[PDB]
Amino acid sequence: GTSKLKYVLQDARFFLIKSNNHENVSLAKAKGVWSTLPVNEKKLNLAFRSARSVILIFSVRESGKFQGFARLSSESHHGGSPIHWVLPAGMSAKMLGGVFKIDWICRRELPFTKSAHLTNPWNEHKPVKIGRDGQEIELECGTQLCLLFPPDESIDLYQVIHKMR
Ligand SMILES: CNC(=S)c1cccnc1
């Protein structure tokens, strides 16, 4: 193991991403990308410049689980390869902001039952599973949440560490 993981998470910022469906998380995992609404895009871009790592922790709504976590490798950009997201009913692709590149750190799931002892000070100390899309997770809570995930032995954090700057 957990030492490189702890190194990547040191002084990181953490954001809860609430996905409407599994398809979008599958796309994010396959293509290494995420796109969010402008209100959250602006926050993530600010955070990316502010901290050595910005971690997105994903949860599919109504799944009762987190599906993994990833580190931003870029601010958002426009004009790249299109992504055929399955958007919420009533939302068009033009309503999204730009695309963030992300490097997955863990593609394994974690059930909410395992995080019940973790509360988020930045959301009224409610259990960390509770939060709107884009809710920031305070450092200690976010670190402990990430350390609860099963180790993902398919991941080598060597290349992620070299991106930290
Ligand atoms: C791929 N991004 C999706 S589906 C989304 C929708 C609404 C808010 N944030 C993100």
Distance 96 CA to ligand 1 centre (A): 7
| β-sheet bridge partners, residue 150 | none
Residues contacting 157, CB < 8 A, separation 6+ = 4, 5, 7, 8, 105
Distance 37 CA to ligand 1 centre (A): 6
Chain centroid, CA 122 distance in Å: 16
Which amino acid is it at 120? N
Q: Hey, CA dihedral for 132, 45, 141, 23, is it positive or negative?
A: positive
Is 85 annotated as belonging to a binding site? yes
In the three-class reduction of DSSP (H, G, I as helix; E, B as strand; rest coil), residue 49 is classed as helix
Nearest CA to ligand 1 atom 10: 36
Query: For residues 108 and 146, is the Cβ–Cβ distance under 8 A?
Result: no
Q: Hey, CA dihedral for 138, 144, 148, 149, is it positive or negative?
A: positive
Q: Distance between CA 20 and CA 77 in Å, rounded?
A: 22
The reported resolution of this PDB entry, expressed in Å, is: 1.2
Residue 143 class from Cβ within 10 Å (0-12 exposed, 13-18 middle, 19+ buried)? buried
Is the distance from the beta carbon of residue 83 to the nearest atom of ligand 1 less than 6 Å?
no
Is 6 annotated as belonging to a binding site? no
For this PDB entry, the determination method is X-ray
Is the distance from the beta carbon of residue 88 to the nearest atom of ligand 1 less than 6 Å?
yes
